[PDB]
Each structure stands twice: as structure tokens, then as C-alpha cells.
Amino acid sequence: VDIIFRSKLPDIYIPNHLPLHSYCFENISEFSSRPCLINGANKQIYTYADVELNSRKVAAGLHKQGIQPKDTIMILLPNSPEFVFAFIGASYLGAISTMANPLFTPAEVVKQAKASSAKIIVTQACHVNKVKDYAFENDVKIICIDSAPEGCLHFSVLTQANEHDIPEVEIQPDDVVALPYSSGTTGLPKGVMLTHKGLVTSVAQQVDGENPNLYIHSEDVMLCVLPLFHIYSLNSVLLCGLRVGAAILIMQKFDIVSFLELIQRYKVTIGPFVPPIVLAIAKSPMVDDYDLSSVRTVMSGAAPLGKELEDTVRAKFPNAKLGQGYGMTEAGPVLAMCLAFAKEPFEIKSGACGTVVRNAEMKIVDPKTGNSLPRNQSGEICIRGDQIMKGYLNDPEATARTIDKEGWLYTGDIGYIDDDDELFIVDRLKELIKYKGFQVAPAELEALLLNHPNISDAAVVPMKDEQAGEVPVAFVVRSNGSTITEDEVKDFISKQVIFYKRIKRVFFVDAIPKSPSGKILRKDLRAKL
Numbered sequence: 001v002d003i004i005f006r007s008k009l010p011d012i013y014i015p016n017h018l019p020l021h022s023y024c025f026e027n028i029s030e031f032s033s034r035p036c037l038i039n040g041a042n043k044q045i046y047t048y049a050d051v052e053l054n055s056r057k058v059a060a061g062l063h064k065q066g067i068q069p070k071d072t073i074m075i076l077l078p079n080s081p082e083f084v085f086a087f088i089g090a091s092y093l094g095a096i097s098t099m100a101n102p103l104f105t106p107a108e109v110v111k112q113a114k115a116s117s118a119k120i121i122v123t124q125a126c127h128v129n130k131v132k133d134y135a136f137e138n139d140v141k142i143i144c145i146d147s148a149p150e151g152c153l154h155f156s157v158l159t160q161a162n163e164h165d166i167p168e169v170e171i172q173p174d175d176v177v178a179l180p181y182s183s184g185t186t187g188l189p190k191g192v193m194l195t196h197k198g199l200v201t202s203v204a205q206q207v208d209g210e211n212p213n214l215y216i217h218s219e220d221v222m223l224c225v226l227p228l229f230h231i232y233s234l235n236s237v238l239l240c241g242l243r244v245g246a247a248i249l250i251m252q253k254f255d256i257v258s259f260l261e262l263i264q265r266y267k268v269t270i271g272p273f274v275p276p277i278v279l280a281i282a283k284s285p286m287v288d289d290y291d292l293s294s295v296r297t298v299m300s301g302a303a304p305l306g307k308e309l310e311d312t313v314r315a316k317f318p319n320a321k322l323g324q325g326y327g328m329t330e331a332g333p334v335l336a337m338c339l340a341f342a343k344e345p346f347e348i349k350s351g352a353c354g355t356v357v358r359n360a361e362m363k364i365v366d367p368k369t370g371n372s373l374p375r376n377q378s379g380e381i382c383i384r385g386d387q388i389m390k391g392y393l394n395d396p397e398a399t400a401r402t403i404d405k406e407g408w409l410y411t412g413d414i415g416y417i418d419d420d421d422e423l424f425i426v427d428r429l430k431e432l433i434k435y436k437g438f439q440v441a442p443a444e445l446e447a448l449l450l451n452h453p454n455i456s457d458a459a460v461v462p463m464k465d466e467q468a469g470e471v472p473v474a475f476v477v478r479s480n481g482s483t484i485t486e487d488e489v490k491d492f493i494s495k496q497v498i499f500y501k502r503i504k505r506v507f508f509v510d511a512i513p514k515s516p517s518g519k520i521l522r523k524d525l526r527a528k529l
């Protein structure tokens, strides 16, 4: 029998039959006039009423541009009001948003645009060159938020539209609404189909209930420095923030001065961070010149924090509950959330990544045997519930390998649950690398390396790094007669990928350590490092 773990919080009613917009704005009449988005770039503020209305106008605009239910748009933007209006606008149409880093190479963007079948790309003028040729050849519309080059439209063509021109649509709970890309537990980035039902469930698991797991309310100011094109910010900052009527303070990029100035000046109360931000707070000499006493909740996720740094950063935020959460794109994303964040808080231990969310089930499985494990025994973390993905777009094989027929998602993370129902992550079984919380899929990098005519074999694995948590390093087997150097390998990769995917070290070997069956012994390579 599977040994099943659940939250210390009771299950709640979740209205996951509601479309995401209908759910997120369900209580909007209670905070219509309250600030919703604050753009750190220009200090422009949109109220809840403004955001709902602009989203509805954009929906009508998108429909006029040809977006039908189940069509997809690509958002290729930094954190911005336009990101939000495009995402929620598509939701109103029963359509799908795929989201991508605007700093991706042209090849990276176009690959995602093709895989997702994006009909419209929403971007900035400076990035039009990345997609222009592709878009022209395939009649994909380009909409720019600042200025529109030839063959492009301005975003105002969407906001000029009449909100009463949203077509009648029957959106189903299992309809897809968000399509972030993720490599999962092996291989290349794949399209994660997140549904109305799934996202409503995940948001509710965090912020709903008499005692919510993550207590946020309409007088909070939540910093949105994490990128909305990644699932952490999209779900736990934007969608959760909207649900409870909180103000969301948008930053386009991390800048330590801007970060501190904004926290102090806007009296930020919720700080959704990642470990490298926590590291910057612990290291920077200017932090002591700032008043950060407004912050009541500091969250870290996406990568391990580690007891030491966690304990330390409580000093810089004297009034804050500090804790970790644990997410994975395929999981909706939140698997576990710190119960110190609850309206009626629980005791926690440093180094834990939370307690499994309510209205969900977790098990811990020995990778060697397939047997479920009891408390205080490490194995592969698995979760099930209505919050998880529908599956991978056009990839039933990858879906079948990732979620079993009993509904269990296998995370590829190794951890244990203690006597207090706190989850601790101790290792990663899957090949995924995390650079500052960003996904780096070794399979992508290995594919590039293998296609170099002077490389015979390659393996990319994480190396521990203070600043980034992990950096990608490559083990390379040179082809016969090859003289390719570490720098030449690095440059070859550097010219083809976004900065965070860059190989930081190259180690040249006679053979890649492989199992008898020829699978890369990634754990062995990690051990060598």
C-alpha cells in the first residue's frame, strides 16, 4: 500500500469549476477601487477595476485579431501591466498564453513559438528582430507594447477595443489557459498544459480557507521581482495576489538599489524571493541603510536556500516570517508551502520547504524498488490532486512517463517528511540544473555539443556555485584529432543560448561515465565535482 501524506490544514471547498478570471476576480467588488498593479518603471498604478476592464478590452481586441477559443498567444515581455492584460485577456476568450523570456535567443523564441503554435506574439520593438522572419513566413501577428515596426501592430489596437465585444464562450474546467515550458524529469523543454481547473486549485490551496496556508490580504503590497514568464511569479504572485485583492509592485529587472528603495518606500509586506536575492540581501553593504521593517512575509523557492543563509536573513527583515515553498511547473506549481505563513501560523524548522498543500496527496517512493516510504526516509517526492498539469502538449509519451494512471506526478526530487509533516529536499534525481532558480535542461546543451564536428560525446551536469546555486558544466569527449579548447567549447555554446544556460566549466575526458545500458552516470559526475 502507498503511504500517503496530507496537509496539517483541513481540506477546503475549491470552486475549480470556475474559469480562472472568474475565480481570480470573484470578490473584486470588495476591492474594486484598491491598487492592483504598480509599475516600478514609471510608477503608474492600475486599480482592480482598471485591470479587469483592461483585460476585458484586450480580450475583445485579441478576438478581433483572430484569437478563437483554444488558440494560443505568445507573451514575450518583461514584467509589465501589458503581460497581465494579455494573459487575462486570453483567459476571457478560452484561449492559451505561452510565456517566454524576452532575453531568449531568436532560435529559442522561434522553437517555442513553433511548438506552441502561437498565432500572435506580444513583445517589445527591440525584440521584433528575433521573430520577424519567422512571423512573416507563417503569418504570425506581432504586437508591440512600445513602438510598432513595419509589419507589426501597437498594443493599443488591443486596448482600444470595446469590452462588450467579447464573444460568448463556454470555457470548460479542463481547458488549457497557460503553457509554460519545462523539461520535467528528463529531456527537452515541453509545453506544460495548465488548465483553468488546475490553476484555480493551486491558487485556492495557497490563499483560500479560514486558515489559508499563505495568508495575504487586500492591504498587502507584494513585490513582483520574479519573472511572470515563470510559474512561481505567475501563480504565487500574480494569480494569488489578484485572488485576495493585494497590490502587486512590478519590477522589470533586479537592481539592488531599486529593490531596497521600493521595499522601503512602498512599505512592501510580502517578499516572494529566490535564493540569489536572499544572498544579495545578506551580502550587500547598503542593506543597513534601509528600513525593511514593513516586510511581514519572506518566501524563498525554486532552489535550495540552506539552513545557514535562511537563519541569517531573519536579521535583515526583523518583522518577517521567513520560510520556503516548493514548486514544479508540472505540479501547478506548488507542492508544499511554509505553514509559518498561515493566518494562524504553525511552527517550522529551518531547511524545510513546507508542508504538502491541502486538498492534495503526497507519497515518497524508493527509486530502486518503487515502494512507498514512511516518515524520515528519503525517496522520490510524488504528488497528486486537481492542481497538477493536464499533461505535455502533443507529447502523450512524456506525459505517461511523468504522471501515472493513479494520477501521481513523479517529481524527480529526493526528500523526506518528518514527524511534524515538514518536507525536506535532500537531492535531485532528475538531470535538471537550476541557475538562480531558472531551468537549464542538460539535454538541450548536450544536443548542441554532440552536433559540433569536433566533439564525440558530452554530458552536462550541475556544479555547486555560491552566487547561482548551480552552474552547468560540461564533460566532453573530443573527436579523434580534435584540439577544441575549453574556451572554444564555451564560446560555441555562448553564441547559441540565453546567458543563464552558458557552460561555466569544461572538463575533458576519455569517456563519459555511463551505466552498462549507456545512461549517463550523472550522480557519479556530480560526485567527481
Ligand SMILES: COC1=CC(/C=C/C(=O)OP(=O)(O)OC[C@H]2O[C@@H](n3cnc4c(N)ncnc43)[C@H](O)[C@@H]2O)=CCC1=O
Binding pocket: 182, 231, 232, 233, 235, 236, 299, 300, 301, 302, 303, 304, 305, 324, 325, 326, 327, 328, 329, 330, 333, 334, 353, 411, 413, 425, 428, 434, 437, 438, 439
Ligand atoms: C515559494 O514557493 C514556490 C516555489 C515555486 C517553484 C517553482 C519552480 O522552481 O518550478 P521549476 O522551474 O519547474 O523547477 C522545479 C524544481 O525546482 C527545484 N525546487 C523548487 N523549489 C525548491 C526548494 N524550495 N528547494 C529545493 N529545490 C526546489 C526542484 O528540483 C523542483 O522540482 C513556485 C511557487 C512557489 O510558491
